[PDB]
C-alpha cells in the first residue's frame, strides 16, 4: 500500500509520503526496508522534481522536505539548463522564499536546522548555475537583508560559507576549469562588501549563534582571501582576544588563527611581523588566563574527556605546531619574546604527554621540525635546552615497539627514533643520564614492569650510532650489566624471559660494538644458541631473529679467522648445526641456514666458499639423496604426508640459503637440479592422479596441498636463483630447457583448478633475466600458458585471482623483452592478445589494470618502432580504433578512476600518432571517405561520431570543441588531462559550455 | 539506549564486510554492492550496560547511492571508511566528510583505513592526516584479520555514553539445555564434511 | 678484553 | 580512629585457541562464527561439561552447548586440524538452535588433543 506515492497519474498524497518517510526513518525491519526501496524509486523518478513545490509547502515532515530538496538538487546540478526558463525562475523563487519564511519563524529557525542547511545548500547549487551573470544583485541584497533580522543574517553566513566551499574548496573535481575560475573571480570581485558585513557582525554583534556562524564562514574565507583583509583590519585582535575568552567561539576562532598562521605573507615587512607576533601573544595569554595555565596536567584533562576538552586540546596542538613551524624565528631573537616562545613550547610538552596516538604523532612531527633545525642552525639550540631535556623523557617513556604485524606502530617508532637521535646529538650527556637513571628505577622496582623495561630498551637501542665509540662502549657495558643484574634479580618465568629478550635486542642494535669486541660477540652468539633449546614460548623465535640480525651486520667477523681462534667461526657454527637446531621449528631452521648463507657469501675465495656451502647443506643433501632413492623406488612414498613434509622442508632450506647467496648458490643448485625437476614431474603425476580419482575436491585435501607445496617451493627456488644469477650462459644452456620441459606441458594439460600460478611467476623471472637470449623458449611459454590461462580469467573479474595477476605480469615482460614472440603468433592468437589487454583495462583490480595500460602503451611503442612495414600498417588498421575507444570507455565510465593518469597517457600517445603522421596508411576504408582524406580528419570524424552516440545529450558543438582542444594538446599531458577532466564534468550534466575547452 | 550510526565511504572499501563481521562473526569474500542502505542492529555489552548501534550501512557506489545524504539525518555517530590499498578512496574521504557533517554538524566520527592485512599498502601511514583538523578518531583496521576491528565501536561508545573508562565485558553465559531426524542430519553432515573449510593456510 | 661481561652473560 | 575514604560456578577442564565455523547448508558454504578461546566448563553443581567459546575483544559468545554424549567428531575433507559435528542445541545467539559446526585449531596436535578431551568430557556427561 505504501507503493501508492509511485503513481504520478494521480495527485500525490502528502500524508502517504509522510508515512513512508516515517516508516523508513523511525521504523524497523521489513517495514523500514520496504519504505527505503519505495522512497528510492520515488526520488529517482525523473518527474519527481515537479512534485517538490507541493511537498515543501504542504508537508509537515522535515525529512520529507529534505528528500524533496535532494530531488531538486539532482535536477539543478544535472538538468538545470534543459528546463524552460519559466521553471528556472520558479524554482529559484520558491527556494528563496522557503528560506526567508523559515528564518522569520523563530520556532522553525531554532528547530529545523537540518532542513534550513539543506535549503541553503540547494540555493548554492542555483547560484553555481545562475550567479552572477543572471543574478548580479544577489550579494548586495544579501547584505541588505542581513540587517533586517538576526536569524536571516546568521543564515546568510551559512549561505556564504557553503558558497565559498563549493567555489574554492570543492570545485576542482566538480566543475570545469573555466566555470571554477569564473565563480572564483565573481566571489573575489564582491568580497570587499562580504568582509565589511562579516567584520561588523564580529565587532558589534552579541548573538552567540550569529557570531559562531560568521566565524565559521571566515574560516572558509581564509583559504583564499588576500592577506590585506586580515593584517589591515584589526580582525586579528578580535580573534586572538575577544573570541578566545568565550568557549562558544573559542574552537572556531582557534581554527581561524591556525589558518591565519598559513596566510601568504611577505617575509620582509616589519609591521606584519609584529602583527604576527601579537596575535600569538594574545592567544597564549587568553589560554593561560581563561582555560588552563602552562603547568596544567593536559594528560589528565584529556583522559577525563569533559565537554569539548579533547577537541580543544587537539586544536591547540594544531595551532601551536602550525604557527611555530612557520614563525618561531620571530620569537627567538627579541629577549622580551623569550617567555612567550618557551611557554608555547611548554604547552606542547604537556600536550605530548597525552595518551592519544594520533595527537602524539601531530606533536611528534613538530618536534622533528624543531630538533632538526637546532641540529643545523647556528646559535639556536641553547634557547631550547630545557624544552629538549623534557622531550627526551617524553619520547623515551612513550617509545613504541620497533619491528625488532603493525605498520602504524613501525612508522611511529622510526619517527620517534629520528627525533631521539637528533636530541642525542644535541646533548649526549643529558640523554645518557636520563637513560641510566630510568634503568636504576627498573632495578629498584619503583618503575619495574614488562612494558616499562621494554620501552626503555627500545629507546636505548634506537640511539645506536650517535654516541662516540668510547662512550658507546662504556654506555653499552653499563646497560648490559644493569640488564644482567636485573635478570638475576627476577625469580619468575616470563619475568626472566622479558629481560633476556631486551638484552638481546639492545646488543643486536649495537653492531659497531660487537665488531670491535670479538670475545663478546662470540659469547652473544653462543648464548643465542643456548636459547634455541629453550621451550618457553617466544624465546626460540627471539634467538633466531637476533642471530640473523647480528649476522647481516657483522658477517665479516664470522668468515675470517679471528686471533685466538683456530678456524673461522662459521666452521664452528656449521659443525654443531644439527645440535644447535635440534629443538627448532622448520621456519626457524631455515632462518638459521639463511643466516649461515649470509656469512658464507662473504668468503670471496671460490673454493672455500663452495666447501662451506656443501658443508652447510650436508644434512639436507643427505636427507635429499635418501629420499630421491627411496621415493623413486616406491612412488607411493609421496602419499606419506611425513615424507612430503620432509621434502618440502629440504627445498625450503635450499630456498633460504639461495636467498642469502644468490649467484653463489649455483653449485648447490647443480647438486639437486636434475633430480629436483624429476621430483617435480612425479609429484605432478600424483596430483593429477589424485584429482582424477577423487575430483576437484582433491585439491583441498592436505595430501594434495602438501604435494603442490613441493612444486611451489621448487618453482620459488628456481625463481630465486635465476633472478640473482650473474652467469646467464649457464642459466640459458643448463637450467632453462630442463625447466621448461618440466613445467610448461604439465601446466597446459592440467585442469584449471590444478594449475599453479607460481608457474607464471617463475616464467616471468625467466623472461626478465634471459628472455632476450631464448626467443624459441619465449614462444614455447606463450604457446603453453597464453590461451589456456586467458580462458580461466575472461569470464569474470573474480575467479583465479593469482593467475590473473601473474598472467599480465608475464605478458608485460614478454612484450618488453621478446616482442618478436607476439609477431610469431597466428593472427587469431594476436587478436586474443589485444582482447586480453583491453580485458585488463576493465579490471578495477589495480594489480591488473595498471599492467593492462602499460602493455597497451608498450605495444604501441613496439609497433611504432617497426616503422612503415606491413605488420604495423595492419596493426593500426585492425586495432588503432579499438584501443582509442576502449581507452575512452574506461576514461568516462566512472568505475576506473584510479587509472585516469595512465589512460590519459595512452590516449595522448594514440592521438599523437595521427597528428604526427606516424601511421603510414589510411585508417579508413577506400570506400567510406574520399580518396586522400588525412587520417587526422578521419580521426576527428570517427571520434565525433563515437562520442555523439555514446553521450547523446552533448551538443555537436561540445564534442567538436572538446576534440579540437584534445588534439591540439596531445603534446602536453597536464593540459591534456585537464581537458579530459573538463569533459568528465560536462558529460554529467546538460548544456555544458563548449568554450570551456578553450581554457588553456 | 540506542544510537544511529551511519557508515560511509567509497564502494569496495569494506563497509558491509566490516559490519557483517560484527553481526555474525563471518568474513564475506565476495563483493556484493550495497543498494542504498542496509540497517542492522548491533549490540555491545559494556561495564555501563548494553549499548545498541543502529548501523546504517550505506552504498559507496554512486549508481547505487539511493537517498545519499538523506541517510545521514539524525545520525548520532559515524564511521568514514577507505581502503589503504586504493589511493582514490582516501582522496574521496574529504568528500564523504563534507556531505556528512553538513547534515550531522556535531557528532563523534571515526575514520577507518581498512584492509591493512594486504602487504602492498598504498596509502602510507604518514599520508593519513585528514582527521587531525577535523577532530576524527583514526584507526588502521582489517575486517579480514580483525585488526583493531572493535576500536571504532569502543571509541564511539565512550563518546556517546560520556564515559572514558567504558569497557566491553563478557556477556553472561547461561547454562545450555540438554538434547526421528537421524537420517536428516547425517545428510547435512555428509555435505558439511565434504565441503572444504576456507583459508586452510591461515594461522587459525 | 671484557672478561667480566662475557662471564656475566654466559651465566644468564 | 580515622574513617577511610556467568561461569563462576564452573571449572575449566580444557582451554585451546580455535576458530569456529557454521555450515550454511543453503549456500553450501562454511561461515566463520568466531575466533577465541574454546573452553570445556564443568558445572560444580551438576558435573555437566559444556563448550563455551567467546570472540576476542568483543568477548561475545559464539558457542554454548553441552558436549552431548551422542555427538561424533568427524574429519573435514580439507583439513588435518579440524573437526566437524552436528549440534542440536546451541544458545550463543538467544533461542536454542541446531547447527553443523566445524572447529579448527593451530595444529593437528591441538586438534587431536581437543578430540581426546572432547571424548573424556562426553563420558563425564554420560555418568
Ligand atoms: N583483504 C581484505 N579484504 C576485505 C577487507 N574488508 C573487505 N574486504 C573485501 O572487499 C570487498 C568489498 O567488500 P564490501 O563490504 O562489499 O565493501 P562495501 O564498502 O560495502 N561496498 P559498497 O559501498 O558498494 O556496498 C569484498 O570482497 C571484501 O571481502 C579486508 O579487511 N581485507
Ligand atoms: Cl600516545
Ligand atoms: Mg556495502
Numbering used by the authors:
A (entry chain C): 0 to 376, 414 to 440, 457 to 1052
B (entry chain A): 9 to 187, 192 to 216
C (entry chain D): 457 to 468
D (entry chain B): 64 to 68, 79 to 200
Authors' account:
NES sequences are very diverse but each usually has 4–5 hydrophobic residues (often Leu/Val/Ile/Phe/Met; labeled Ф0–5) that bind hydrophobic pockets (labeled P0–P4) in a hydrophobic groove formed by HEAT repeats 11 and 12 of CRM1 (9–16).
The Φ4 anchor position is clearly not used in mDia2NES and CDC7NES even though Φ4 is key for activities of several other NESs. The number of Φ anchor residues necessary for CRM1 binding can vary between 3–5.
